[PDB]
Design a protein around this ligand. Structure first.
Ligand SMILES: *[C@@H]1O[C@H](CO)[C@@H](O[C@@H]2O[C@H](CO)[C@@H](O)[C@H](O)[C@H]2NC(C)=O)[C@H](O)[C@H]1NC(C)=O
Ligand SMILES: [Ca+2]
Ligand SMILES: [Ca+2]
Length: 274
C-alpha cells in the first residue's frame, strides 16, 4: 500500500462548471475558463489507516468526538429523514458505538469535519485543494464531460465509481460491489491517476460556498472571501440519478465546517511534494 501517494496534476486551462447545469440551485453554471498552476493531488481519499497515523502522532480529537454525535445514514444502522444524529458515531465507529473500522482499514475515513481535514492535511505537509483544483483534477484531462472518464455512467458495461444502485433510500443492490464505502484504491483511476474522485466519500475543499459565479477568466481562484458553509465535491456511495445526481465533476454541495457525516471524507493537495 502507498495510500498517501500524490500525483502531479499538470498546469492547464479548463472549463469549470457547465452551461448545461443539472442542479441549477447549486450554481453549476455558468461555465467559466480557469487557469490552474501545476500542483500535486493525493491519488486516494485519506484512509482510516492514514488518519490513524495522524491521530497516533498528534492525539487529535475530531469534532464529532467532542460533540458526541455525527450523522449516520438510516440504511446502515438532519438534512433528510434518512440522516440521523447518532450518539457515539465518529471516524472509529462509523455507524455508532457498536461499529468498528477494524475490518475496513483501507476505506476512506469518515465523520471528519472541514477543520479535521485541514488539521490532517497540514500535519501531512499538505493542504485541502480549492474547488477549482479539485474539479480540474476530477475532470482528468477531458473537456466538458459529465464524469472523470466521459459521459457514459458504465462505459463498456463496467462500473467506474462507487455510488448507489437500486431504489434510494430503501434498497441498495450493491451491484457495483459495495453497499457502503469501498477501499480507497478501488475502481479505475481517471486520466490523472486519481481514484474515487467521484463517488465513495464526498470530499471537502478549501472554498467558502457561493452559488454566484462570474464568467470572467481566473487564475488559481480560491472562492469567495467569506461564507458560512465550505464546498464539498464528488458525491458518495449514496448518490443516485434519482435524487442526488452529484457524482459529476461539475456538481457541488456544502456544509458548515464543523459538520460531519457517514459519507463525507477528503483528500489533500500540495504545491510541491512534501
Ligand atoms: C496507532 O498506534 C497503535 C497503538 O500503538 C498501533 O497499534 C499497536 O502497534 C504496535 C506496534 O507495532 C503493535 O505491536 C501492537 O499490537 C498495537 N497495539 C494495539 C493495541 O493495537 C497502531 O498500529 C497505530 N496505527 C497506525 C496506522 O500506525
Ligand atoms: Ca455502491
Ligand atoms: Ca470520493
Amino acid at each position: 500500500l502507498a495510500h498517501s501517494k500524490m500525483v502531479p496534476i499538470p498546469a492547464g486551462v479548463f472549463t469549470m462548471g457547465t452551461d448545461d447545469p443539472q442542479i441549477k440551485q447549486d450554481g453549476e453554471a455558468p461555465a467559466r475558463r480557469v487557469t490552474i498552476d501545476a500542483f500535486y493531488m493525493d491519488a486516494y481519499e485519506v484512509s482510516n489507516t492514514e488518519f490513524e497515523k495522524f491521530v497516533n502522532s498528534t492525539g487529535y480529537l475530531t469534532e464529532a468526538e467532542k460533540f458526541g454525535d455525527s450523522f449516520v445514514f438510516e440504511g446502515m444502522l438532519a438534512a433528510a429523514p434518512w440522516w440521523l444524529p447518532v450518539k457515539g458515531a465518529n471516524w472509529r465507529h462509523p455507524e455508532g458505538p457498536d461499529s468498528t473500522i477494524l475490518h475496513r482499514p483501507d476505506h476512506p475515513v469518515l465523520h471528519v469535519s472541514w477543520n479535521d481535514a485541514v488539521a490532517y492535511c497540514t500535519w501531512a505537509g499538505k493542504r485541502l485543494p480549492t474547488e477549482a483544483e479539485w474539479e480540474y483534477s476530477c475532470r482528468g484531462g477531458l473537456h466538458n464531460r459529465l464524469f472523470p472518464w466521459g459521459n457514459k455512467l458504465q462505459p463498456k458495461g463496467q462500473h467506474y465509481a462507487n455510488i448507489w444502485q437500486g431504489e434510494f433510500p430503501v434498497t441498495n443492490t450493491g451491484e457495483d460491489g459495495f453497499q457502503g464505502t469501498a477501499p480507497v484504491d478501488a475502481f479505475p483511476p481517471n486520466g490523472y491517476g486519481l481514484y474515487n474522485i467521484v463517488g465513495n466519500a464526498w470530499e471537502w475543499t478549501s472554498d467558502w460556498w457561493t452559488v454566484h459565479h462570474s464568467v470572467e477568466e481566473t487564475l488559481n481562484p480560491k472562492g469567495p472571501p467569506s461564507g458560512k458553509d465550505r464546498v464539498k465535491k464528488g458525491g458518495s456511495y449514496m448518490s443516485h440519478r434519482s435524487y442526488c445526481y452529484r457524482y459529476r465533476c461539475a456538481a457541488r454541495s456544502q456544509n458548515t465546517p464543523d459538520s460531519s457525516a457517514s459519507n463525507l471524507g477528503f483528500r489533500c493537495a500540495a504545491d510541491r511534494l512534501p
